[PDB]
């Protein structure tokens, strides 16, 4: 019973997680496109980060 | 948390999902839509090789904190101003993220209210 | 490597002043360290940057129109 | 190759002309010198082989086995020195003659440029082993054991001979070099299926395979200590050598035909490792451990990948040394207690500490502790099998866990606890026994320094 | 060091910063490294100089063995054993050489990953691409021959692959 | 009253909770007396053999010999082909082999199909 | 137990996951599994600890709970902080085992806490050393355990994790405080309960010096190391006031609750234990069943 | 441990054993001394109420509900003395216990040191050699016919006699040999 | 360890000490050889409680079979000496 | 060098139930007609240096007084030095 309740509650916690009232982290250079994987000869879609 | 309680015990549509945020165009609120500024370029921030998750808009203060830590080495309590500056920059970043969260929440509430008003007008 | 101390049989064991003074000194040192750090760096426990209230932000800075423009 | 064979033959007239009290000294000294001579074969090349003549050739698969075969004879003499003390000089000379004939047969078997010569010597090894088991065994079951050890072998090997001559009627040759250079694919036919079975089962009975392993516990338990050493250390590796040599002509039929034997070995290693857990006999436990290790070697050979072959070579060498050492330790216990039951003589670490150290080292190396060559072979075979199929890892992990369990069980039951009170005839260990264990264990820890010497021709 | 070629094992110029002491407090690292130099580096250097002059007093050389090219397995008759033997030996030597080439490229990759530190994902893409290409070529050459590999099996694999390539190209052209 | 302790195979009944020992009869007392008599005769024989100064070697134990012989060499002569024995042998000796064969054959068939279609992504797979 | 199974060997597995953190950060399922495993481990081990009578068993279960906390830290993608916790826990847990061994040796190889009473005055150096170690373990501001555990709690609270994992981490912190005060109360405070022949003795320079070196470590190492290592992660600079103190308020709440529950043992009233106490005392019954059901069913089959 | 067991336990023996176990487990439950004293006098008072009970069926009905009650409240983790069969040092020094006969296998160079010890040991060996031959006849004549009924050995009855089967009881290694 | 090597005199002294703190016994009427059942009029439960006292005093536990047949302080001292291997 | 000093046992009449919680136990036992026969045997646990106990919070604050005095001295010195 203890093990089953533990597993069920962990699944429930996975279904209803906990987070903060914050938006996603913002990274400057096209979400660090050049330094995460690289591939510079494709010129990906530029991303603009909001000022607030 | 109170947002967790309001979302899990209330309705889902009133509050956002952190995974898909934002769901609205940036300049939907106001049209000027200023751009965020960066100080450190590619080359020197790569040379300092900070970390992938540490390369955010607060990078310059981290660079100066590392410069202090390297320069005044034996006095490991010498440069405290730069630690405070980097903490303040990260505080501003987190505050802006919270403001973005609240802005998206208010936009969602306004959209829901507008849809309800349109439905009521159609019904009448 | 110590001094000779004999058993007691139902009374308080003999205490060397050295161990008492060392223990008291180390406890005092720990408490002084705690108080010194709290005085010099009180912000690591209480926090330095205020937590903003989302409900206190006006709609002007947050980009909200009075429900008719859009 | 004759520079090794001729001194081995000369070991016989020297043994028969030696004084009545100098047979052991002469045999040991000259066997050690022959092993030193045989060490020269380890200088192999990345090219084809060391083809000495039309009859004998060497390889980096053959060389480690030859070195182990030569090195085993002095240890066998040293261990047999004890229980043959009350024997007449003629019978001691006959025992040494049997050992020398076995060594000569193994040496000529491992080079054997041709397959029929290989078969002739591979069966010639049977007679001295059978005589040793059935003449100088202690119990009344030895005779029965001998029968098993004989007939099983022949039941697999007589078909092989047929297949062999059949091949020479079609291909035109049985030379290993010509067979490798002119190999052609085997069509998936019933005739080819039975040719595969005839070529394979003779060597699979000698490993032995899990279904055909019944003769091994009998032969190991009933044979004298030298017989047990030569059975566990070298004679089990003849089947592995034969399969490694003969799988070249069996492709691509091996892919389909290997499934039953792969299943048998992968489940039989688990079965025999579990059998080791509930055993009242030390020799039976060591024999079943040998069965498990050779089941893993069978899996390696059947998978037929370069890493499989390297790991199999390393594991055969390591298991030979380790199993011989374990049998020697059990024999040293038996010569004092005369019972050969694990549970009776207990708490021996308190009485014989250095022998307990030898026991600990032997159990650690049987348990495949890195960076021992046992672990190297185990890990190479496991990696190759994982590449073969990712679900094998479950069975291999189970086998590793059970192996550790029964190894430490055997160590703890005999060395730890409280000594038996009524057993009072436990004398201090002799210099001969300690030297025997040292000569068993030092080559293993020296070989872990240069693993490429025992990694086979695919290194 | 002249003991190895700089082109086979390339290295960046290794720019290093200058010491900038912002305080008058004297660091333990410089004093520690000076006393280490005095107490360790000098005696080691003197012993090495003695050993080097002893070696110079007795100089001798060894040579890298060179091998002629021999007709490969494609220029061998079906049952002519001599040419097949020579071709097989040549193929095995080439196999060893290719193994060493892959080893060199892997060493380059590992050195890159360690050297570039926190920016290895971006500053080592060239070595990653080099190793990817070399590994692809090696895998195409020798991936599935298995134990008892031979020049004939490699040639058969190449013929099968090139037959597939020719058929695919023909279908694409005739699509 | 208190909740009842329920004995199991791996947690046996306590000695003081048996219903049997509390039922004392002269026959039970005689049985215990003769059990102690047998145990004391065995103990006297063992101690007489044990304290002998002329004794050397190990005191051979017939019980241990019987145990080992029954465990090892008395199985097959007492074996009888029975539906229970036949079914258990067939299951425990054949079922695992065919189960593992099916598992491995299915896995290798899926792998072969994937490699035939080319969607397996075997990049950097050089050692096998 | 003090060297291998408390501070050096047992962290090895955690250290392994620290070695492969570039690969662990790119997978989300394995991170969640690690977080859940750490949470359940720390909760279960603290729950077992809070009711033990052997002192060594209590400290071992504390070690297991700390390892579970390290696994939680790894699961929330904070490997450097887990390494820092490893380093601090080494110091203070090793010292705690030193003090326990000193108590055991002074009482003629007695390990049960039911037979040790007033040692606050009978042996002052061990008393102060174990008090400092317990305060470091539970987490006292600016001690060696603060710079690690406080950051662990803040990072777990400030992250997108399981709600259940966070709840179990907080309950595990309270139970850590609980078993710490249990050890203090039942080993130092009451009346003596050991045999009459008193053989208590600490005046050996080896024991005193060995304990005092780790005392200096557990006092100052956290500060010096945290202020000397370079920054490796983004901090939680802004944080709610109530949630900044959650680690503290949980610690004091556990302290007072366990202290009050222990103070009732002086009352002249006795009652039979409940099912929860039995479950906690027999280690969730896991060692019973799992050491009897599988092994038998294996060994029997093997014969 | 030293005394030979009996064929059975009488009722009073079982009652005393249950009293012992109940008091030990109550002490384990009540950590403090005053609380344990209070509850121990209470348990003794509860025990002695049925002291003068004469019905044996009622006596067996008693003590049995008592064993059941004890098993319900038996403190799953009772206090055990360190050297007791459940203690943390039960067989710590069993690995330091070496048999006496091992000394007979020592090298003469080892026996050169400690000569007085081996002289006294030789005296002991002589005494054992004579005494055993006396003891065999003593036990053979004293034993009841058909075999012993209780594993209790008789003492010595003559002047120069020694107790039968004494050598391995007198020459125990030690309680703490090292 | 650092345990003083207790002797027969010490064992007897501690046994008599514990017995003299037993207020059911008049201290001036007890002796080394004084029987428990008859010379002192003690119950069997009293004898077992004396066994508890000896156990908690000397730190080792006496098995029930041996303990139930100990009726004099002298034989208790002898049993404890035999258990602890006391020379003099 | 071992502890051979011929230690002598104290007087048995010294140990009295009076002044200890064993008295309170005796008073509760007399209200039901019972008495403890082993009361004096356990009196030594409350007689000598074991008579005075300390609380949990008192145990935690082992060296708070000296630490606080040193803290205020250091703070005063720092305040008088920095104001220069
Ligand atoms: C660790 C580095 C050491 C390097 C220094 C050089 C050491 C050379 C030793 C060579 C091997 C010993 C020969 C085996 C027979 C034992 C000899 C003997 O009779 O003892 C009497 C002698 C006298 O004692 P005594 O009082 O008269 O007798 C009392 C009783 O006998 C009571 O006996 P006891 O209770 O005292 O037991 C004796 C002791 C020792 O007895 C043994 O059990 C020895 C067995 C050790 C390994 C067991 C097999 C596992 C496979 C490992 C193979 C690696 C070998 C590497 C190359 C070896 C070269 C020959 O047992 C142990 O302590 C258990 C050891 C378990 C070690 C497990 C860790 C394995 C990996 C270690 C690292 C290896 C590679 C590192 C690579 C990366 C770093 C560079 O005792 C000793 O001398 C002890 C030996 C020293 C300890 C060795 C333990 C580790 C060494 C491993 C091999 C060397 C590593 C090479 C470089 C590594 C860096
Ligand atoms: C959001 C607002 C935030 C604020 C929240 C509220 C603030 C606090 C409110 C307080 C809440 C509770 C705190 C009191 C805890 C209880 C302490 C107590 O009275 O113990 C004595 C009492 C019995 O003692 P006894 O048997 O007479 O022992 C005799 C002697 O005293 C033997 O004594 P001894 O000398 O041998 O040793 C004494 C030892 C021995 O005492 C024990 O036996 C301990 C056992 C119970 C205490 C453990 C409580 C922790 C709960 C963890 C549960 C995890 C999930 C498990 C799921 C199981 C699934 C079946 O006790 C201790 O050392 C101290 C106990 C621990 C207390 C200190 C820390 C606990 C507070 C933290 C709890 C939650 C707050 C989280 C903080 C963060 C805020 C979110 O224990 C209980 O009666 C248990 C009460 C609660 C247990 C809940 C579990 C019941 C489960 C039943 C089945 C349910 C259905 C499941 C369905 C599954 C089907 C699939
Ligand atoms: C005792 C302990 C172990 C001892 C050793 C055991 C290992 C030996 C087992 C031999 C392996 C299998 C033998 C033949 C394998 C061929 C594959 C066949 O089984 O699969 C199907 C074959 O179908 C049926 O199996 C036909 C054969 C049925 C009759 C065989 C008896 C089955 C059980 C007997 C086992 C007894 C073994 C021991 C004998 C003493 C495939 O159908 P099909 O495409 O058409 O045939 C392909 C082959 N062709 C192309 C040459 C025609
Ligand atoms: C450990 C004990 C196990 C005993 C070993 C059993 C396995 C060996 C296989 C059985 C004997 C077969 C020997 C075949 C010799 C090789 C020659 C050969 O393969 O040539 C084939 C010959 O193939 C045969 O004749 C096979 C007939 C088999 C007759 C005897 C059967 C013996 C029992 C078989 C049942 C058991 C099968 C599995 C045994 C596995 C081991 C338990 C082609 O014949 P041709 O006519 O010349 O070709 C022209 C037409 N294509
Ligand atoms: C925490 C665990 C809880 C444990 C609960 C245990 C239950 C307690 C209640 C026990 C109930 C009984 O009294 S069970 C009562 C069983 N019936 C009798 O005892 C009748 C005659 N008694 C004897 O003969 C004895 O030996 C005696 C005279 C006492 C001594 O004799 P001695 O003169 O030779 O000392």
Strand order of the largest sheet of chain D: 1-2
Oligomer category: part of a larger assembly
Order of helices and strands of chain J: HHH
Number of strands of chain J: 0
Strand content of chain D: under 5%
Identify the most extensive interface between protein chains: C-G, 37 and 38 residues
Question: What is the alpha-carbon Rg of chain J in Å?
Answer: 24 Å
Distance between the termini of chain D: 23 Å
Q: Please provide the count of β strands of chain D.
A: 2
Shape of chain D: globular
Structural class of chain D: mainly alpha
| Major sheet size, sense and barrel closure of chain J | none
First-residue to last-residue Cα separation of chain J:
61 Å
Transmembrane segments (chain A): 1-19
Main location (chain A): mitochondrion
Keywords (chain A): Electron transport, Membrane, Mitochondrion, Mitochondrion inner membrane, Respiratory chain, Transit peptide, Transmembrane, Transmembrane helix, Transport, Ubiquinone
GO biological process, one term (chain A): mitochondrial electron transport, NADH to ubiquinone
Walk me through the structure.
The structure is cut from a larger assembly and holds 10 protein chains of 10 kinds. Chain A is mostly helical and 52 residues long. Chain A has one helix at residues 2-15. By secondary structure, chain E is an all-alpha fold. In chain E, helix 2 packs antiparallel against helix 4. Chain E starts with 27 loop residues before the first helix and ends with a helix. Chain H is an all-alpha fold and 178 residues long. In chain H, 49% of the residues lie in helices and 0% in strands. Chain H has helices at 11-29, 33-48, 56-61, 64-72, 108-112, 115-142, 167-170. In chain H, helix 1 packs antiparallel against helix 2 (33-48). Chain H is flat and about 65 Å long. The two termini of chain H are 23 Å apart. The C-G interface holds C 1-3, 5, 7-13, 15-16, 18-20, 22-24, 26-27, 29-30, 33-34, 37-38, 41, 44-52 and G 121-122, 124-125, 127-129, 131-132, 135, 140-143, 196-206, 208, 212, 215, 219-220, 223, 237-241, 244, 248. One cardiolipin sits between chains G (50-51, 170-171, 174-175, 178, 182, 250, 254, 257-258, 261, 265, 271, 273-274, 276-277, 280) and A (1-2, 4-5).
Topology:
This is part of a larger assembly, with 10 protein chains of 10 kinds.
Chain D: H1 2-17, H2 23-38, E1 50-51, E2 57-58, H3 62-83, H4 89-111, H5 115-124, H6 126-135, H7 142-170, H8 176-181, H9 190-204, H10 215-222, H11 225-235, H12 237-246, H13 254-277, H14 282-303, H15 306-337, H16 348-351, H17 353-366, H18 373-388, H19 392-415, H20 431-447
Antiparallel strand pairs in D: 1-2
Chain I: H1 8-20, H2 44-58, H3 64-67, H4 73-84
Helix pairs in contact in I: 1-2, 1-4
Chain J: H1 21-30, H2 56-60, H3 64-82
Give the structure's gist in a few sentences.
Chain H has 178 residues and is mostly helical. Chain H is built from seven helices and no strands.
Keywords:
part of a larger assembly, 10 chains, D: 459 residues, mainly alpha, two-stranded antiparallel sheet, globular, G: 303 residues, 15 helices, 69% helix, binds cardiolipin, binds ligand PLX, binds 1,2-dioleoyl-sn-glycero-3-phosphoethanolamine, binds ligand 8Q1, NADH dehydrogenase [ubiquinone] 1 beta subcomplex subunit 8, mitochondrial (chain A), transmembrane helix (chain G), NAD (chain G), transmembrane (chain G), EC 7.1.1.2 (chain G)
């Amino acid at each position: 019973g203890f093990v089953a309740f533990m597993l069920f509650m962990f699944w429930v916690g996975e279904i209803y997680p906990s987070y903060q009232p914050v938006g996603p982290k913002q990274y400057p250079y096209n979400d660090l496109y050049l330094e995460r994987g690289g591939d510079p000869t494709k010129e990906p879609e530029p991303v603009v980060h909001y000022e607030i | 948390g109170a947002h967790l309680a309001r979302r899990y015990l209330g309705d889902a549509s009133k509050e956002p999902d952190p995974l898909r945020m934002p769901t609205f165009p940036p300049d939907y609120g106001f049209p000027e839509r200023k751009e965020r500024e960066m100080v450190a370029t590619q080359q020197e921030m790569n040379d300092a090789q900070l970390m992938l998750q540490q390369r955010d808009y607060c990078a310059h203060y981290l660079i100066q904190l590392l410069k202090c830590k390297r320069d005044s080495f034996p006095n490991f309590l010498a440069c405290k101003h730069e630690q405070h500056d980097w903490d303040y920059c990260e505080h501003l970043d987190y505050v802006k993220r919270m403001k973005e969260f609240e802005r998206e929440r208010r936009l969602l509430q306004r959209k829901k209210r507008r849809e309800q008003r349109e439905a009521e007008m159609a019904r009448g | 490597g110590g001094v000779h101390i004999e058993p007691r049989y139902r009374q308080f064991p003999q205490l060397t002043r050295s161990q008492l003074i060392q223990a008291e000194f180390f406890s005092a040192t720990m408490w002084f360290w705690i108080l010194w750090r709290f005085w010099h760096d009180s912000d690591a426990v209480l926090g330095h940057f205020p937590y903003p209230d989302p409900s206190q932000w006006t709609d002007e800075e947050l980009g909200i129109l009075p429900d008719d423009e859009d | 190759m004759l520079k090794i064979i001729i001194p081995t033959t000369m070991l016989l007239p020297m043994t028969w002309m030696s004084k009545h009290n100098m047979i052991w000294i002469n045999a040991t000294v000259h066997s050690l010198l022959i092993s030193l001579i045989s060490l020269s074969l380890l200088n192999q090349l990345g090219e084809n082989s060391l083809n000495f003549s039309l009859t004998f050739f060497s390889d980096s698969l053959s060389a480690p086995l030859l070195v182990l075969t030569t090195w085993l004879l002095p240890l066998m003499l040293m261990a047999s020195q004890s229980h043959l003390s009350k024997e007449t000089t003629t019978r001691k000379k006959l025992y040494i003659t049997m050992l020398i004939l076995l060594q000569l047969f193994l040496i000529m078997t491992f080079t054997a440029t041709e397959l029929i010569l290989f078969y002739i010597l591979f069966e010639a090894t049977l007679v001295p082993t059978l005589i040793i088991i059935t003449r100088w065994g202690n119990q009344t079951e030895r005779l029965n054991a001998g029968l098993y050890f004989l007939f099983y072998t022949l039941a697999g090997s007589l078909p092989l001979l047929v297949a062999l001559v059949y091949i020479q009627n079609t291909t035109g040759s049985l030379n290993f070099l010509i067979i490798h250079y002119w190999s052609h694919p085997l069509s998936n036919s019933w005739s080819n299926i039975f040719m595969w079975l005839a070529c394979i089962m003779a060597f699979m009975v000698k490993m032995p395979l899990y279904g055909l392993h019944l003769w091994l516990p009998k032969a190991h338990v009933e044979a004298p200590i030298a017989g047990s050493m030569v059975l566990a250390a070298v004679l089990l590796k003849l089947g592995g050598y034969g399969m490694m040599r003969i799988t070249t002509i069996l492709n691509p039929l091996t892919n389909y035909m290997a499934y039953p034997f792969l299943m048998l070995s992968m489940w039989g290693m688990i079965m025999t490792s579990s059998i080791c857990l509930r055993q009242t006999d030390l020799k039976s436990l060591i024999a079943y451990s040998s069965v498990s290790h050779m089941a893993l070697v069978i899996v390696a050979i059947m998978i037929q990948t370069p890493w499989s072959f390297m790991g199999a070579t390393a594991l055969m060498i390591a298991h030979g040394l380790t199993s011989s050492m374990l049998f020697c330790l059990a024999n040293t216990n038996y010569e004092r207690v005369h019972s050969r039951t694990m549970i009776l003589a207990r708490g021996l670490q308190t009485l014989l500490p250095l022998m307990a150290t030898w026991w600990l080292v032997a159990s650690l190396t049987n348990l495949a502790l890195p960076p021992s060559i046992n672990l190297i072979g185990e890990l190479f075979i496991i990696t190759a099998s994982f590449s073969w199929s990712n679900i094998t890892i479950i069975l291999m992990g189970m086998n590793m866990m059970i192996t550790a369990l029964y190894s430490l069980y055997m160590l703890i039951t005999t060395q730890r606890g409280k000594y038996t009170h009524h057993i009072n005839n436990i004398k201090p260990s002799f210099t001969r026994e300690n030297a025997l264990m040292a000569l068993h264990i030092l080559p293993l820890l020296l070989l872990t320094l240069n693993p490429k010497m025992i990694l086979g021709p695919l290194y | 060091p002249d003991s190895w070629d700089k082109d086979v094992y390339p290295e960046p110029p290794r720019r290093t910063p200058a010491p900038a002491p912002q305080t008058s407090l004297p660091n333990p690292v410089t004093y520690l490294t000076k006393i280490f130099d005095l107490l360790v580096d000098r005696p080691v250097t003197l012993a090495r100089e003695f050993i080097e002059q002893q070696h110079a007093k007795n100089r001798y050389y060894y040579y890298h063995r060179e091998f002629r090219r021999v007709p490969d397995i494609t220029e061998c008759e079906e049952k002519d054993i001599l040419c097949m033997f020579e071709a097989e030996m040549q193929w095995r030597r080439d196999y060893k050489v290719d193994q060493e080439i892959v080893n060199i490229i892997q060493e380059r990759l590992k050195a890159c990953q360690q050297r570039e530190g926190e920016s290895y994902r971006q500053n080592c893409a060239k070595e990653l691409e080099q190793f990817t290409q070399v590994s692809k070529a090696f895998q195409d050459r020798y991936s599935d021959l298995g134990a008892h590999y031979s020049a004939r099996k490699c040639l058969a694999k190449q013929k099968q692959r090139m037959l597939a390539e020719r058929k695919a190209a023909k279908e694409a052209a005739a699509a | 009253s208190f909740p009842k302790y329920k004995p199991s195979r791996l947690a046996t009944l306590p000695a003081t909770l048996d219903p049997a020992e509390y039922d004392i009869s002269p026959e039970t007392r005689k049985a215990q007396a003769e059990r102690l008599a047998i145990r004391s005769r065995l103990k006297r024989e063992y101690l007489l053999q044990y304290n002998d100064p002329n004794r050397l070697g190990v005191i051979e134990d017939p019980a241990l010999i019987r145990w080992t012989y029954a465990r090892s060499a008395n199985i097959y002569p007492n074996f009888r082909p029975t539906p229970k024995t036949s079914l258990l042998g067939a299951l425990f000796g054949i079922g695992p082999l065919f189960f593992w064969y099916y598992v491995f054959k299915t896995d290798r068939d899926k792998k072969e199909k994937l490699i035939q279609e080319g969607k397996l992504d075997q990049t950097f797979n050089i050692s096998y | 137990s003090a060297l291998l199974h408390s501070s050096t060997m047992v962290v090895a597995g955690v250290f392994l996951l620290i070695r492969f953190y570039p690969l662990m950060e790119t997978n989300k399922l394995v991170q969640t599994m690690t977080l859940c495993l750490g949470a359940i481990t720390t909760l279960f081990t603290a729950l077992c600890a809070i009711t033990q009578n052997d002192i060594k068993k209590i400290v071992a279960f504390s070690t297991s709970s700390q390892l579970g906390l390290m696994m939680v830290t790894i699961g929330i993608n904070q490997p450097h902080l887990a390494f820092l916790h490893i380093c601090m826990h080494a110091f203070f847990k090793a010292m705690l085992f030193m003090c326990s061994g000193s108590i055991i040796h002074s009482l003629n190889d007695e390990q049960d806490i039911r037979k040790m009473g007033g040692l606050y005055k009978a042996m002052p150096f061990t008393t102060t050393a174990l008090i400092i170690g317990s305060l470091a373990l539970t987490g006292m501001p600016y001690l060696t355990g603060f710079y690690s555990k406080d950051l662990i709690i803040e990072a777990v609270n400030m992250s997108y994790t399981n709600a259940w994992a966070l709840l179990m981490t907080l309950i595990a912190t309270s139970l850590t405080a609980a078993y710490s005060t249990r050890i203090i109360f039942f080993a130092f405070l009451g009346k003596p309960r050991f045999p009459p022949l008193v053989l208590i003795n600490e005046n050996n320079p080896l024991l005193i010096n060995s304990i005092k070196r780790l005392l200096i470590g557990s006092i100052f190492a956290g500060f010096i190391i945290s202020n000397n290592i370079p920054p490796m992660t983004v901090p939680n600079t802004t944080m709610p006031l109530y949630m900044k103190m959650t680690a503290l308020i949980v610690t004091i709440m556990g302290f007072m609750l366990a202290l009050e529950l222990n103070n009732t043992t002086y009352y002249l009233k006795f009652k039979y234990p409940s099912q929860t106490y039995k479950f906690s005392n027999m280690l969730g019954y896991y060692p019973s069943i799992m050491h009897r059901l599988p092994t038998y069913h294996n060994l029997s089959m093997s014969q | 441990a030293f005394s030979a067991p009996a064929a059975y336990l009488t009722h009073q023996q079982k009652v005393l054993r249950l009293y012992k176990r109940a008091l030990r487990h109550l002490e384990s439950w009540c950590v403090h001394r005053d609380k344990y004293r209070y509850f121990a006098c209470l348990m003794r008072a509860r025990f002695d109420e049925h002291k003068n009970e004469k019905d044996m069926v009622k006596a067996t009905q008693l003590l049995r509900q008592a064993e059941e009650e004890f098993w319900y409240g038996q403190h799953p983790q009772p206090y055990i003395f360190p050297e007791s069969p459940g203690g943390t040092s039960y067989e710590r020094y069993e690995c330091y216990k070496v048999p006496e006969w091992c000394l007979d296998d020592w090298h003469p160079s080892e026996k050169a040191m400690y000569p007085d010890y081996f002289a006294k040991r030789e005296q002991w060996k002589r005494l054992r050699r004579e005494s055993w031959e006396r003891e065999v006849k003593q036990l053979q004549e004293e034993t009841p016919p058909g075999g012993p009924r209780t594993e209790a050995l008789p003492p010595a009855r003559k002047e120069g006699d020694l107790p039968p089967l004494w050598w391995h009881i007198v020459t125990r290694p030690r309680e703490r040999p090292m | 360890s650092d345990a003083p090597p207790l002797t027969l005199e010490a064992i007897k002294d501690r046994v008599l000490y514990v017995l003299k703190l037993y207020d059911k016994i008049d201290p001036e009427k007890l002796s080394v050889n004084s029987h428990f059942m008859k010379d002192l009029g003690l119950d069997s439960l009293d004898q077992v409680e004396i066994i508890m006292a000896m156990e908690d005093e000397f730190g080792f536990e006496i098995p029930d079979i041996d303990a139930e047949k100990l009726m004099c302080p002298q034989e208790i001292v002898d049993y404890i000496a035999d258990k602890k291997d006391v020379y003099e | 060098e071992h502890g051979h000093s011929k230690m002598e046992l104290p007087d048995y009449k010294q140990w009295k139930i009076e002044g200890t919680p064993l008295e309170t136990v005796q008073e509760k036992l007399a209200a039901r007609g019972l008495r403890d026969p082993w009361g004096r045997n356990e009196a030594w646990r409350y007689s000598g240096g074991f008579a005075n106990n300390v609380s949990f919070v008192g145990a935690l604050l082992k060296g708070f007084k000296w630490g606080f005095a040193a803290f205020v001295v250091a703070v005063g010195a720092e305040y008088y030095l920095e104001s220069q």
